[PDB]
mmCIF file of C-alpha atoms in Angstrom:
data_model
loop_
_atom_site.group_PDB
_atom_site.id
_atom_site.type_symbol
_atom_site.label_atom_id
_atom_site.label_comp_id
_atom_site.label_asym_id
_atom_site.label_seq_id
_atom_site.Cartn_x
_atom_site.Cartn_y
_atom_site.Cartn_z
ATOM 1 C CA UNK C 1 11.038 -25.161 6.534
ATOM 2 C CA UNK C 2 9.371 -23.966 3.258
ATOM 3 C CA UNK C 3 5.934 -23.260 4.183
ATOM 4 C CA UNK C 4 5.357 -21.470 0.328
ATOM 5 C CA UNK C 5 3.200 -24.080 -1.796
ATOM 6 C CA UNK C 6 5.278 -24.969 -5.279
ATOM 7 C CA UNK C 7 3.844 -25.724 -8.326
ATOM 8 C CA UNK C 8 6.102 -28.095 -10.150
ATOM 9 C CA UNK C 9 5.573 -27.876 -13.988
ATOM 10 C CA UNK C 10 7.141 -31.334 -14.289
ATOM 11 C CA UNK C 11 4.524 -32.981 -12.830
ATOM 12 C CA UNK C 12 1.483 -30.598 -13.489
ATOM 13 C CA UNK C 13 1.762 -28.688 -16.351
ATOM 14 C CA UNK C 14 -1.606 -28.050 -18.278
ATOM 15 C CA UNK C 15 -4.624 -26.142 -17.698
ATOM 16 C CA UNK C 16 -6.926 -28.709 -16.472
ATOM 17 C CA UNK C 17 -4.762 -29.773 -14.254
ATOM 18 C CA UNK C 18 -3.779 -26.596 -12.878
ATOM 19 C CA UNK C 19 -7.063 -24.487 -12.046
ATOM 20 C CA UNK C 20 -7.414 -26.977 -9.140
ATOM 21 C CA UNK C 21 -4.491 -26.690 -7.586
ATOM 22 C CA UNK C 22 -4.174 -22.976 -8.566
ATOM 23 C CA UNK C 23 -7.790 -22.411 -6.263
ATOM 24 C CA UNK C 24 -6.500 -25.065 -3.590
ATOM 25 C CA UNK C 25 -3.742 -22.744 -2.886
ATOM 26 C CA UNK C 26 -5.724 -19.003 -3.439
ATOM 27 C CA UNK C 27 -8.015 -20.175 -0.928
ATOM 28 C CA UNK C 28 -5.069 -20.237 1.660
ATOM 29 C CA UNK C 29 -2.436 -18.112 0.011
ATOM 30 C CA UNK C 30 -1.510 -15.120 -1.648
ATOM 31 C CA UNK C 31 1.832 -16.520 -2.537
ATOM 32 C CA UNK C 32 3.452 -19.379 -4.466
ATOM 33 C CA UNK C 33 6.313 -20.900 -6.115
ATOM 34 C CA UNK C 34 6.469 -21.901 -9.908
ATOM 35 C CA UNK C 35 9.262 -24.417 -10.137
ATOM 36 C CA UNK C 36 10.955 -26.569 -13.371
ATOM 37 C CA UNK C 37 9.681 -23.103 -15.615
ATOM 38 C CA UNK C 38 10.674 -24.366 -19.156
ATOM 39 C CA UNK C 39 12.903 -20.779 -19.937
ATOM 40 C CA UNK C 40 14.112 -20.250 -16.712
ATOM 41 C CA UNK C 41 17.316 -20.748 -17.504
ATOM 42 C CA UNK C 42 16.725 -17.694 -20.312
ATOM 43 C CA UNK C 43 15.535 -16.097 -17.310
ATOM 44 C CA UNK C 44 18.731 -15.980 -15.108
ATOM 45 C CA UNK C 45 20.959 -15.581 -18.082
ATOM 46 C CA UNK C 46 19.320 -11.942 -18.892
ATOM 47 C CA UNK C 47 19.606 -10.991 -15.239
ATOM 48 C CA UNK C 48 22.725 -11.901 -15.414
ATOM 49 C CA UNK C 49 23.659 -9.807 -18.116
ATOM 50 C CA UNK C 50 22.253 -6.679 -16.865
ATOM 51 C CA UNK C 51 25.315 -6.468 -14.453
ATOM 52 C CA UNK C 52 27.359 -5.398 -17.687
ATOM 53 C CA UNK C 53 24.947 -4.978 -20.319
ATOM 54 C CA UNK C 54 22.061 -2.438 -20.798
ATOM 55 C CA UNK C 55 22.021 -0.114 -17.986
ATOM 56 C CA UNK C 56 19.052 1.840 -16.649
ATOM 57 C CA UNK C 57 19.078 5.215 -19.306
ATOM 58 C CA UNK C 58 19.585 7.932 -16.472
ATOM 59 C CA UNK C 59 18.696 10.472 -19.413
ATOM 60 C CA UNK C 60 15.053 9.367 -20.080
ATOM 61 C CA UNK C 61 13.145 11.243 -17.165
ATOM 62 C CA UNK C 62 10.919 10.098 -15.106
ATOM 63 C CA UNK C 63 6.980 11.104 -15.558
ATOM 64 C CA UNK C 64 3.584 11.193 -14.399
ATOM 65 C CA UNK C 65 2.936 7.637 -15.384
ATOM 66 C CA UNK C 66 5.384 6.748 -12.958
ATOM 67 C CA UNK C 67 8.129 5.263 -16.086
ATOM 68 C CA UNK C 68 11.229 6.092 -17.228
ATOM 69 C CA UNK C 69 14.046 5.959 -14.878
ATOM 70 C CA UNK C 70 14.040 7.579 -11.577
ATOM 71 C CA UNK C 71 17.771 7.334 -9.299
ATOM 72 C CA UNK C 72 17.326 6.625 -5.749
ATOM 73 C CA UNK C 73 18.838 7.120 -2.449
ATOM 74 C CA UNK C 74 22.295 4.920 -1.777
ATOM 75 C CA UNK C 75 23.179 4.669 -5.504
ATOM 76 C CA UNK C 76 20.030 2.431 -6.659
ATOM 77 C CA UNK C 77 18.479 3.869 -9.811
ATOM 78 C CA UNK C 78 14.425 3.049 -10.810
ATOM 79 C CA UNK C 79 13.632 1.664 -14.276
ATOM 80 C CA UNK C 80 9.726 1.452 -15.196
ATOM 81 C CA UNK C 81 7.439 0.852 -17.899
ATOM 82 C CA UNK C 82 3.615 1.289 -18.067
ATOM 83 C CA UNK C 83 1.553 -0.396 -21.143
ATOM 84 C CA UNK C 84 -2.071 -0.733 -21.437
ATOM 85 C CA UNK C 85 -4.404 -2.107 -24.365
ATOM 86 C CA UNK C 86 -6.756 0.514 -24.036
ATOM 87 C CA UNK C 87 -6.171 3.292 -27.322
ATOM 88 C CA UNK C 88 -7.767 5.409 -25.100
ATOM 89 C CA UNK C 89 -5.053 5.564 -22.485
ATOM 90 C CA UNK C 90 -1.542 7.247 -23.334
ATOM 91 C CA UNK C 91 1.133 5.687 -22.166
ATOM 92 C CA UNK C 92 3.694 6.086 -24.795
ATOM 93 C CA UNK C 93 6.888 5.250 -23.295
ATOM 94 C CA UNK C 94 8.045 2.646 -25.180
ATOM 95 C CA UNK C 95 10.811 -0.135 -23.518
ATOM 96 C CA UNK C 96 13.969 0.315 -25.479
ATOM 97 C CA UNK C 97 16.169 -1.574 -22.891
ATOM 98 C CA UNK C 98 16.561 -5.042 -25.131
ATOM 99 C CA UNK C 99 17.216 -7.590 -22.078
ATOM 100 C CA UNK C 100 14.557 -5.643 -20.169
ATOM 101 C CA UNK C 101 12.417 -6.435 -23.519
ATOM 102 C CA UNK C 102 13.649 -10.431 -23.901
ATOM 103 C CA UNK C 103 12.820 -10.493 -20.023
ATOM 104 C CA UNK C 104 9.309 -8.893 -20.521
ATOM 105 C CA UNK C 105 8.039 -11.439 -23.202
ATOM 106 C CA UNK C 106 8.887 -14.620 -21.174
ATOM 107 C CA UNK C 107 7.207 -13.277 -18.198
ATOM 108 C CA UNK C 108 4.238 -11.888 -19.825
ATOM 109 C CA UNK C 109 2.695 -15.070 -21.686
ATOM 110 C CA UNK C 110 3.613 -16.200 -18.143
ATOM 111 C CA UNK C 111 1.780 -14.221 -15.845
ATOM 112 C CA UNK C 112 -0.992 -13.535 -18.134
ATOM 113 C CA UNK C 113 -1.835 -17.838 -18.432
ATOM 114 C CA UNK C 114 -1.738 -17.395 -14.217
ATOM 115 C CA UNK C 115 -3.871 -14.409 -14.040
ATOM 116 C CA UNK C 116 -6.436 -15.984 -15.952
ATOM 117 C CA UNK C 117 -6.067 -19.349 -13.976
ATOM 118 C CA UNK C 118 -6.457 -16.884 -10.568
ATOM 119 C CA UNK C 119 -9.664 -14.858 -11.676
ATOM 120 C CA UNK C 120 -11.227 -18.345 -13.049
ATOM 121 C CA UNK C 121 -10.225 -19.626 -9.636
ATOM 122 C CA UNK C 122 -11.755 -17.543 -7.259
ATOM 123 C CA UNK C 123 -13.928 -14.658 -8.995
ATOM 124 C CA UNK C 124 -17.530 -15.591 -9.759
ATOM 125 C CA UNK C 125 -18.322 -12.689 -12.328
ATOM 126 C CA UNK C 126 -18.409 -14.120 -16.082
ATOM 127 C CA UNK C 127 -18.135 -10.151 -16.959
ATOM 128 C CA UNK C 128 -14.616 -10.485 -14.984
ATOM 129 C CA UNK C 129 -14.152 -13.829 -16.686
ATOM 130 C CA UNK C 130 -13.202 -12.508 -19.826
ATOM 131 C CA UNK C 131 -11.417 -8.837 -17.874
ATOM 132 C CA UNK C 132 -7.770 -10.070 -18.730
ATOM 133 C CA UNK C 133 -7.257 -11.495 -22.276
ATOM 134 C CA UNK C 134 -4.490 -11.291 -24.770
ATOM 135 C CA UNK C 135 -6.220 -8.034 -26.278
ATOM 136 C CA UNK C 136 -7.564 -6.669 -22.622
ATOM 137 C CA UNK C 137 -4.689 -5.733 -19.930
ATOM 138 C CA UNK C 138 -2.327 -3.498 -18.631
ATOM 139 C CA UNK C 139 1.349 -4.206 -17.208
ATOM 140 C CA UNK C 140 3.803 -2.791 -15.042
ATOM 141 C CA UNK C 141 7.318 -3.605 -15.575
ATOM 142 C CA UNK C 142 9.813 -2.966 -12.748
ATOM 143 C CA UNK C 143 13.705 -2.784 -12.679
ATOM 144 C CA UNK C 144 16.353 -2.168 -9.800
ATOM 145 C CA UNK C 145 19.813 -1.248 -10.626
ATOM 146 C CA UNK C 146 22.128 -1.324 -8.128
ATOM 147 C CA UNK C 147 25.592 -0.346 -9.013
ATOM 148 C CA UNK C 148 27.015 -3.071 -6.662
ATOM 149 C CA UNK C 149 17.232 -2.103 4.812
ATOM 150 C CA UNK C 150 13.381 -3.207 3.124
ATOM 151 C CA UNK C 151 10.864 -1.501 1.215
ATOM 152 C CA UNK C 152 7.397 -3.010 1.973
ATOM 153 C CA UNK C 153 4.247 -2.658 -0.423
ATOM 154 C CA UNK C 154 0.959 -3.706 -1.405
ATOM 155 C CA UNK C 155 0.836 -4.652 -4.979
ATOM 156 C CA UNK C 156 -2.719 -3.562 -6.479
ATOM 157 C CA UNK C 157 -2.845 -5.934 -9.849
ATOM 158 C CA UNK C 158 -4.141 -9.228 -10.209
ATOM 159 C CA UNK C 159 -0.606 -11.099 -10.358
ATOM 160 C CA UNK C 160 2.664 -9.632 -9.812
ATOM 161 C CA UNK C 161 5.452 -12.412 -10.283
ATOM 162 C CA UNK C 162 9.394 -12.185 -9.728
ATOM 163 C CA UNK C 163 11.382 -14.116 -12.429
ATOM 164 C CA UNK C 164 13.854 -14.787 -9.175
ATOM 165 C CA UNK C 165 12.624 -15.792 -5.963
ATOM 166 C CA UNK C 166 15.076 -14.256 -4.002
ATOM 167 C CA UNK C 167 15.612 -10.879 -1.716
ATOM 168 C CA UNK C 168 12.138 -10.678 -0.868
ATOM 169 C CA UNK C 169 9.949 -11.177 2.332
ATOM 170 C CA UNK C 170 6.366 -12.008 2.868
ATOM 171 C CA UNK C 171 3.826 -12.711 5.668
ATOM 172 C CA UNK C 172 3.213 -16.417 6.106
ATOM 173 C CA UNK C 173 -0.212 -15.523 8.396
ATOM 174 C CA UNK C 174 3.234 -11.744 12.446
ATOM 175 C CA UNK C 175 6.947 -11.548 11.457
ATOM 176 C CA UNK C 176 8.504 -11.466 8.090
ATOM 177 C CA UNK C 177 10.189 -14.863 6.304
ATOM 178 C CA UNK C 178 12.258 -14.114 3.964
ATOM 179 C CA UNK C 179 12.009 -16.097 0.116
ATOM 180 C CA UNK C 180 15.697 -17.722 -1.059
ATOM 181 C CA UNK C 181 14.880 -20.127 -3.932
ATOM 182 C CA UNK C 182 17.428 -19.471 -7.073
ATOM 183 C CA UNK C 183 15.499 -22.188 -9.355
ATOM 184 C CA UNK C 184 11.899 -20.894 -8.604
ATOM 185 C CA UNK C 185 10.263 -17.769 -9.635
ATOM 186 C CA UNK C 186 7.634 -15.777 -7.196
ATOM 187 C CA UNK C 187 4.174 -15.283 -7.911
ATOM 188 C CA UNK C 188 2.331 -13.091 -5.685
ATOM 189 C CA UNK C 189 -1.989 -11.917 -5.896
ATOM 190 C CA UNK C 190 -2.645 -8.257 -5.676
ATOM 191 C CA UNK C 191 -5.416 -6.004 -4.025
ATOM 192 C CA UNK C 192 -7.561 -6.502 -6.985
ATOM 193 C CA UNK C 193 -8.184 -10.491 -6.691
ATOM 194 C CA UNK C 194 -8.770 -10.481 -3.213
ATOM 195 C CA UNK C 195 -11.678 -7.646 -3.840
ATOM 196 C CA UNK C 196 -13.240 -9.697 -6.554
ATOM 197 C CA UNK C 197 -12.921 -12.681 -5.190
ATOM 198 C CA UNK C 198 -15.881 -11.421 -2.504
ATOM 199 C CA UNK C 199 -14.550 -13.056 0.366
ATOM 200 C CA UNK C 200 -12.414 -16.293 -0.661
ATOM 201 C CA UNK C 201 -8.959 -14.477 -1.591
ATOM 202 C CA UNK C 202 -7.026 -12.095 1.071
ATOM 203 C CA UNK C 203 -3.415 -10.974 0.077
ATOM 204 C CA UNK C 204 -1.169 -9.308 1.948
ATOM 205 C CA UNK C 205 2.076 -6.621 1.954
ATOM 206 C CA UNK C 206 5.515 -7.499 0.306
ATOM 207 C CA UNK C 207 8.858 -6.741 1.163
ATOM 208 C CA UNK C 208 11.866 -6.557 -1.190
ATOM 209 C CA UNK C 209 15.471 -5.779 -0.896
ATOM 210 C CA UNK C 210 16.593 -3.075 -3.516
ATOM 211 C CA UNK C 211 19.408 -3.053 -3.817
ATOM 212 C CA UNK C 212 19.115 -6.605 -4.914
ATOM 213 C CA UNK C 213 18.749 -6.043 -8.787
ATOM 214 C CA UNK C 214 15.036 -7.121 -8.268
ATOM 215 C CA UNK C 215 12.426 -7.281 -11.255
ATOM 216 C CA UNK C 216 9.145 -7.871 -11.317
ATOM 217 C CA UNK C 217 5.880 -7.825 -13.932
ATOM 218 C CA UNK C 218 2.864 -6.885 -12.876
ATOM 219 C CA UNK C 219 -0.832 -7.607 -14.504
ATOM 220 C CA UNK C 220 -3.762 -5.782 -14.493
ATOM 221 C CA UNK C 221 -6.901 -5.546 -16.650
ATOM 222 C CA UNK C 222 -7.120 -2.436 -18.783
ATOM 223 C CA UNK C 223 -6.748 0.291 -16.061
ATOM 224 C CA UNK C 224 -10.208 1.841 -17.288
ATOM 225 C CA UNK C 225 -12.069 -0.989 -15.697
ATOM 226 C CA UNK C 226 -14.427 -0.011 -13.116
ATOM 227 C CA UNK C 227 -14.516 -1.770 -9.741
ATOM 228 C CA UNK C 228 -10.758 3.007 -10.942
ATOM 229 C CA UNK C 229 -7.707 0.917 -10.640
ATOM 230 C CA UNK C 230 -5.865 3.774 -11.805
ATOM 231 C CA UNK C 231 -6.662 5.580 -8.427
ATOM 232 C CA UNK C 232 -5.422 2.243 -6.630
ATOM 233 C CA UNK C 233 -2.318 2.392 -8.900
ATOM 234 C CA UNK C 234 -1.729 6.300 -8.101
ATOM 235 C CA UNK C 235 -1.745 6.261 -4.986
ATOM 236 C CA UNK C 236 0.368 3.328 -4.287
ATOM 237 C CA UNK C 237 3.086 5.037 -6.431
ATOM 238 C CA UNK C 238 2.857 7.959 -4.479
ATOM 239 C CA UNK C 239 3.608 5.765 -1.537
ATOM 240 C CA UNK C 240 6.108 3.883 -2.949
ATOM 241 C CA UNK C 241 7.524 6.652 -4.337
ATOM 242 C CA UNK C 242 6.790 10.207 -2.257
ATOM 243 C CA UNK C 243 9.800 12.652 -3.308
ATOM 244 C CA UNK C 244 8.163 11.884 -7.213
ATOM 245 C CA UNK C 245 4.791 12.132 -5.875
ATOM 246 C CA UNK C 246 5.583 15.758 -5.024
ATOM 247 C CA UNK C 247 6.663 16.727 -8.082
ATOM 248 C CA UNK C 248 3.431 15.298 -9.837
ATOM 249 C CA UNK C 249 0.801 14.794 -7.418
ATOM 250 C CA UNK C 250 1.191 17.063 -4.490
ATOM 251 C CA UNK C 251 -2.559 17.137 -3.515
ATOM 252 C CA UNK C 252 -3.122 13.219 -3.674
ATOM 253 C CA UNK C 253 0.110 13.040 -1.189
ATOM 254 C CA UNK C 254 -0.806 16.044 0.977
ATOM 255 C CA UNK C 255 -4.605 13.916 0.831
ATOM 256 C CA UNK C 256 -2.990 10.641 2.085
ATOM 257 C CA UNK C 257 -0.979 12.071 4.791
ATOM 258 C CA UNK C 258 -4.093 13.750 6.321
ATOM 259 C CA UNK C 259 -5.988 10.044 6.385
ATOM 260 C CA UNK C 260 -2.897 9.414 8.338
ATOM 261 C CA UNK C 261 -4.081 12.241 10.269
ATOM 262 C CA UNK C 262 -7.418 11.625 11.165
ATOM 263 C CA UNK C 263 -7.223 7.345 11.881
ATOM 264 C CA UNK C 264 -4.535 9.195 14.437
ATOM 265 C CA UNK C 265 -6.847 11.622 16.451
ATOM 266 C CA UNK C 266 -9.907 9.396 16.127
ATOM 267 C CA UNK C 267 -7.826 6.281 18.026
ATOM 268 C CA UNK C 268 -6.343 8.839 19.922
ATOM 269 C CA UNK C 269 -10.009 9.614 20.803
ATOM 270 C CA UNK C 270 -10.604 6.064 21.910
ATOM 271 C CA UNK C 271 -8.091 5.919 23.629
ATOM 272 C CA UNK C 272 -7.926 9.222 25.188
ATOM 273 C CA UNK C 273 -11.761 8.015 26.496
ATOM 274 C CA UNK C 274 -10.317 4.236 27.860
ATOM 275 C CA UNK C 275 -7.372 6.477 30.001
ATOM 276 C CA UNK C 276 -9.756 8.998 31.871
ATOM 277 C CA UNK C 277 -12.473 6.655 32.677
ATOM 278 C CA UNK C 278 -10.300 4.144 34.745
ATOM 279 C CA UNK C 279 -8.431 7.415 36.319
ATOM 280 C CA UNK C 280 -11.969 9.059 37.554
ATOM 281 C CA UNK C 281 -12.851 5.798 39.431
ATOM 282 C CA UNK C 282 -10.412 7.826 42.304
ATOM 283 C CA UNK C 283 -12.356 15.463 43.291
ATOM 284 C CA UNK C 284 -8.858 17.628 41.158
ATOM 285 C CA UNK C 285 -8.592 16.632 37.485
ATOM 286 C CA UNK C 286 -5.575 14.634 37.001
ATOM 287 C CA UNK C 287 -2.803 16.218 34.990
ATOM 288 C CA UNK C 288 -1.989 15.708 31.514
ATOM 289 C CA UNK C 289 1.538 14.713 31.569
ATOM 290 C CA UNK C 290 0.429 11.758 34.359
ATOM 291 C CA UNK C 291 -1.866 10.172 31.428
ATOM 292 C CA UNK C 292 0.326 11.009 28.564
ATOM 293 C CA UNK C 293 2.863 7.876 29.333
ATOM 294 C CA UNK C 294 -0.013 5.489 29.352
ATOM 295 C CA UNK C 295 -1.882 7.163 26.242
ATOM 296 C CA UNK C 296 1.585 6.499 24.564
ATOM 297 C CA UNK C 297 1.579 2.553 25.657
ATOM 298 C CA UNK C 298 -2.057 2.008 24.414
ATOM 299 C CA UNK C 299 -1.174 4.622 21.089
ATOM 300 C CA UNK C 300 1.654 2.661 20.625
ATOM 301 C CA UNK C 301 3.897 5.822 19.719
ATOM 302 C CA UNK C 302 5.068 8.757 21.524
ATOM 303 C CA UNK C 303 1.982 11.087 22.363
ATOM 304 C CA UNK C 304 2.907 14.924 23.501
ATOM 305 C CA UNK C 305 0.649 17.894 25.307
ATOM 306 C CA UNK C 306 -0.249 19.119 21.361
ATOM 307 C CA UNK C 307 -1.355 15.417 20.381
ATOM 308 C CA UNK C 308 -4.312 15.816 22.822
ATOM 309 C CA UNK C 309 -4.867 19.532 21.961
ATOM 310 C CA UNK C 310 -5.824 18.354 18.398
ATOM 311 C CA UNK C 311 -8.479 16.612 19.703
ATOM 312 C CA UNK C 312 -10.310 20.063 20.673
ATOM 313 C CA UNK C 313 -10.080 21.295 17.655
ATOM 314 C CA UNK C 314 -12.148 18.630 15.875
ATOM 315 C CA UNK C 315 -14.642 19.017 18.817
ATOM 316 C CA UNK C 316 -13.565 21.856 21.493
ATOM 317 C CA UNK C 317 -16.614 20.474 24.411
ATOM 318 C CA UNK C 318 -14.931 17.031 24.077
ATOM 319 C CA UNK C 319 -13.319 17.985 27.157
ATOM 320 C CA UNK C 320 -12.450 20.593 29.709
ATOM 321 C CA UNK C 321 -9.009 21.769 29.285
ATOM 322 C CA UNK C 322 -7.935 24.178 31.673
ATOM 323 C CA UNK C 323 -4.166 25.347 33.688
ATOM 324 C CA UNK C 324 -4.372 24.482 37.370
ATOM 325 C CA UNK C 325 -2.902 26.858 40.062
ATOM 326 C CA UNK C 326 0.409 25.099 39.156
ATOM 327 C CA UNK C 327 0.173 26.486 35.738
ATOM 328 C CA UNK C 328 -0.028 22.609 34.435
ATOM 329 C CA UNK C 329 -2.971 21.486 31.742
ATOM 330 C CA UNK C 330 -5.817 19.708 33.569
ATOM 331 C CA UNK C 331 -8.424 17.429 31.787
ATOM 332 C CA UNK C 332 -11.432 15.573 32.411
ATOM 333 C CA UNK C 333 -14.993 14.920 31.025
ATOM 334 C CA UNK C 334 -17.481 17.599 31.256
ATOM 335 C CA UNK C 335 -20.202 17.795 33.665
ATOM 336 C CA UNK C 336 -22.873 20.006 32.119
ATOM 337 C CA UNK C 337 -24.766 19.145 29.067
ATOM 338 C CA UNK C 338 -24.627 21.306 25.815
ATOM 339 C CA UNK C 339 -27.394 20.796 22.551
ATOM 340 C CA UNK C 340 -24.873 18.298 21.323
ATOM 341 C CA UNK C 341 -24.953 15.829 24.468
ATOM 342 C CA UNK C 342 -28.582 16.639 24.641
ATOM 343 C CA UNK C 343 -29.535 15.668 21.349
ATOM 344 C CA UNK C 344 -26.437 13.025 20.539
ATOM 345 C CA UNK C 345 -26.284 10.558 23.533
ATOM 346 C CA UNK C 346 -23.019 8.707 21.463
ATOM 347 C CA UNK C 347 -19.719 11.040 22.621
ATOM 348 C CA UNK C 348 -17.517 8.409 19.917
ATOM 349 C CA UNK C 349 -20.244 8.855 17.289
ATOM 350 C CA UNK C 350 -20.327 12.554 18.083
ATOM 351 C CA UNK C 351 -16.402 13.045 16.902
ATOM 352 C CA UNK C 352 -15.906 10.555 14.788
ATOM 353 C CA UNK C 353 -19.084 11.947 12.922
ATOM 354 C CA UNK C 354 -17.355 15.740 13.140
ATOM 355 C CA UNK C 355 -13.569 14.331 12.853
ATOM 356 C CA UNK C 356 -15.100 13.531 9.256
ATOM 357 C CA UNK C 357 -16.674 16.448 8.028
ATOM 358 C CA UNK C 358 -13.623 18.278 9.310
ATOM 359 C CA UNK C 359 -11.783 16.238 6.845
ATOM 360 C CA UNK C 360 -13.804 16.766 4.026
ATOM 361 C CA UNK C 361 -13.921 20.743 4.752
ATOM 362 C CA UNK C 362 -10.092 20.166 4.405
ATOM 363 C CA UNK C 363 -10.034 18.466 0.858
ATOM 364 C CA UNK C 364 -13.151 20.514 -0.299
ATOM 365 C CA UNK C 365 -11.507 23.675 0.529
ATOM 366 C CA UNK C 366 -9.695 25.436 -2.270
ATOM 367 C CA UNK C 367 -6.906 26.445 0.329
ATOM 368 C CA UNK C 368 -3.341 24.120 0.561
ATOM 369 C CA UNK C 369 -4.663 20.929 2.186
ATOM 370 C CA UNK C 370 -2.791 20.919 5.434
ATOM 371 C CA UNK C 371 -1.407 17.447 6.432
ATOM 372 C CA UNK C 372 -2.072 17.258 10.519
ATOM 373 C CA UNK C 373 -5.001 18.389 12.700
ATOM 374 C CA UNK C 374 -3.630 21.827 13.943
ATOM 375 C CA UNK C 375 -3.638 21.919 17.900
ATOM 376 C CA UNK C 376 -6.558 23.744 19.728
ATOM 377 C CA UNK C 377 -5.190 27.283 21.844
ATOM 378 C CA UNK C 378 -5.574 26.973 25.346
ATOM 379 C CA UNK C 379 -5.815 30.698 27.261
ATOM 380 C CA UNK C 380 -4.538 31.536 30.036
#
């Protein structure tokens, strides 16, 4: 059962008529078909043709902007091109790939008429109003090859649409559905909307098949705009695309894999606090190991010895950490007061507050950011 609203151009097909139902269905969705698209025949006809005809250049590079042509793992090669408005900006790599160019056109007079429709539809800025315009944007054009398993993401743009509604996956709002409609294309809403729409618009995470020939165009305005969608772009590159990321931007990936990091000790924290109070309602400090299997439930991944050791390095009085007579690690909360209990009657406010700063000593540091809390040395 199709539970994706469709907007039939048959029946509804101007402006007027479409804001309405465009808001009607941002309001409650992130996601939406476009059916009875005048060229979509065009459409399927180019896809077709790049089976045979105008393969991905494998000579071109792959830069910084994230274009050019990047191969992949299990024989699935990357094709992307950047353009923004701005004069400003440089992104010079010009589309040379003629179907890729024919396929561009017909979704870009496409997606640019919805974008406007979507910021008109649930953004109340007029200075937004006007953001995306036929002289004021920026687009991202993306190309699988496959020369005959799911990668999920979180576009950033306004719209990103699919000139194929097939070989992808969404959330419906808890398990993925996937999208098989040949005669529809795929519009989906972006990080950006749902932040300027203040409330009214959440989206939410694709997933696409790639080694399914997939293409998609994505629309921004120009990516000087202040909400700093450049550092939204960035870094979702360098998650989409880590092994590149490394080459380019090895701080900004070393910098997202420490957030990782730190949202891991700080619920570890939490939970670390939940496991030892319902133990001490039983004189001897209960042994690590004997908590770890329930710290793992609640963590929801496998949590060893050094997990909990990291915790004493953001704050070593946290706990008391010592090796019984049976040479195993004891733990349990401290007894005595130091300045910091005395002073700071929050113990989560207390880390959390130093699990921070600890962080930004990291990133201000002009050492190689380190990607993991390193664990705290217990004597013997």
């Amino acid at each position: 059962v199709l539970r994706v609203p469709v907007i039939d151009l048959n029946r509804v097909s101007d402006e007027e008529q479409l804001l309405p139902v465009v808001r009607a269905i941002l309001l409650q969705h992130d996601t939406f078909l476009l059916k009875n698209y005048a060229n979509k025949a065009v459409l399927d006809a180019l896809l077709a043709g790049l089976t045979t005809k105008d393969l991905p250049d494998t000579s071109q590079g792959f830069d910084a902007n994230f274009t050019g042509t990047l191969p992949l793992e299990d024989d699935v090669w990357l094709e992307q091109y950047i353009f923004d408005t701005d004069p400003q900006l440089r992104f010079d790599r010009k589309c040379r790939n003629e179907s890729l160019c024919s396929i561009y056109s017909r979704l870009f007079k496409l997606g640019l008429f919805f974008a406007q429709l979507c910021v008109k539809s649930v953004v109340s800025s007029a200075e937004l109003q006007d953001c995306i315009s036929t002289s004021h944007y920026a687009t991202k054009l993306t190309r699988y090859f496959n020369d005959n398993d799911y990668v999920t993401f979180l576009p950033t743009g306004v719209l990103t649409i699919f000139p194929c509604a097939k070989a992808i996956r969404y959330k419906p709002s808890n398990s993925w559905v996937s999208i098989d409609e040949p005669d529809c294309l795929l519009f989906h809403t972006g990080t950006l909307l749902a932040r300027w729409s203040q409330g009214m618009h959440t989206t939410s995470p694709l997933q696409i098949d790639p080694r399914a020939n997939i293409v998609s165009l994505t629309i921004w305005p120009p990516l000087t705009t202040p909400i700093t969608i450049a550092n939204h772009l960035l870094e979702q590159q360098i998650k989409a695309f880590p092994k590149v990321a490394q080459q380019y931007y090895p701080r900004e990936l070393s910098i997202l894999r420490l957030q990782d990091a730190m949202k891991f000790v700080k619920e570890l924290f939490t939970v670390c606090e939940t496991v030892l109070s319902l133990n001490a309602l039983s004189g001897v400090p209960p042994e690590l190991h004997v908590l770890l299997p329930q710290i793992s439930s609640m963590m929801k991944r496998k949590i060893v010895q050094d997990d909990i050791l990291k915790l004493l390095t953001i704050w070593s009085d946290a706990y008391v950490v010592e090796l019984n007579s049976r040479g195993e690690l004891t733990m349990n909360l401290p007894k005595r007061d130091n300045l910091t209990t005395l002073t700071n009657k929050s113990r989560t406010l207390a880390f959390v507050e130093r699990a921070e700063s600890w962080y930004q000593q990291v990133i201000a540091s002009k050492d190689e950011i380190m990607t993991d809390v390193p664990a705290f040395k217990i004597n013997k």
